[PDB]
């Protein structure tokens, strides 16, 4: 153990949200050094008293004030010169949150903004490569697991769910087949509530229950 | 950067091979401390002069003498007490090699043995959890990419290819549909060579060319 070097261990969060048709990431225009004024993911460092997963949770809560967040580890990024300051190996995670539900004041302190995932600014270091990989993993996984519902409020319309999925895959779906495919899922249940987008339009709301899903975990959408 | 701790950065390789129907891992019965006499993955440590990926390659070559090996990063394992000695965060990779082709002498020095992935001994620390995750990733990926061919010699029979796939999924396939599905792949080409398993039996040999695959990269098996 002792003849080997030690490394600063970074945490970087790719924070996904969904709103009005598009998938956005929560990014920081850095107040601080290095690369001041440039865009980046939310970052921190693993501490001696916490696991790497717990560091991810802390860093995310620091920005958002959110806990019990769906998170996935993306990977350990460890090119020698990835960060020009000192050597840092960073573990990237992605997170899927409800965009109506984070802590606005914390976001303001970090000087963070939501940006459309298809219209991102240049990001520092190897952050573009972290985003690319997290996207692929998320697309891969959201086609066989119900992880997408973390991006939606507890109650959602089918129009929104469809729109979510079109945004995830950058491709429009057949409305007919989609609606059917959802009706065949018992754990996506139709409620007797409606979304009132303005005085003159409504739409039926659904909810996902993970009890019904976990008793029969079949998902493909 | 400087107010944060630094960590020993481990490398752990899950080394997959394929032979006579079954998938095996190359494991070490440790000559050395800690946990002497117990079974583990092949490990090392990231050095100051190498990227994390390059450390993975080195550690694997140390045991096998192999280079240009198909490898995938599995993840950063960072529970505080994962390794009871000092704190180590370890990056697990998996590797897919041709079992006829490694360096026997290096394997002997490390006191490593091939073991059936379904009949593994107890492994130390969080190595079981690394193996579990690498298996899932490998199964997931080998169903949509031609990564399986790294586990086979350059020339293979369809009987072997089938057998490989049955072992990957722990499930027998329909011989008929399988054979057809392969005929529909131009990049799996039939040669005029035969495997001579003993004096009295042969079978037609095929090869994968990644040129033909990369020009039209469609794979599902």
Author numbering:
A (entry chain A), B (entry chain A): 5 to 225
What did the study's authors say about this model?
In this study we identified and characterized a novel L-arabinose-responsive transcription factor found in the Bacteroides species, which belongs to the NrtR family of Nudix-related transcriptional regulators. In this work, genome-scale regulon inference using the comparative genomics approach revealed that the NrtR family AraR regulators in Bacteroides and Prevotella spp. control not only the L-arabinose catabolic operons, but also several other gene loci involved in the utilization of arabinose-containing polysaccharides. The predicted AraR-regulated operons are involved in the uptake and catabolism of L-arabinose and the decomposition of arabinose-containing polysaccharides (e.g., arabinan, arabinoxylan, pectic galactan) to oligosaccharides, their translocation into the periplasm, and further hydrolysis.
We determined the structures of full-length apo–BtAraR protein, its complex with a specific DNA duplex, and its complex with the L-arabinose effector. The solved structures provide a first view of the structural mechanism underlying the regulatory function of the L-arabinose-binding Nudix domain. The Nudix signature motif GX5-EX7REUXEEXGU (where U is a hydrophobic residue and X is any residue) is strictly conserved in all known active Nudix hydrolases, but it is impaired in the NrtR regulators of NAD metabolism, several of which are known to be enzymatically inactive. These observations suggest that AraR regulators are also enzymatically inactive and utilize their Nudix hydrolase-like domains for ligand binding.
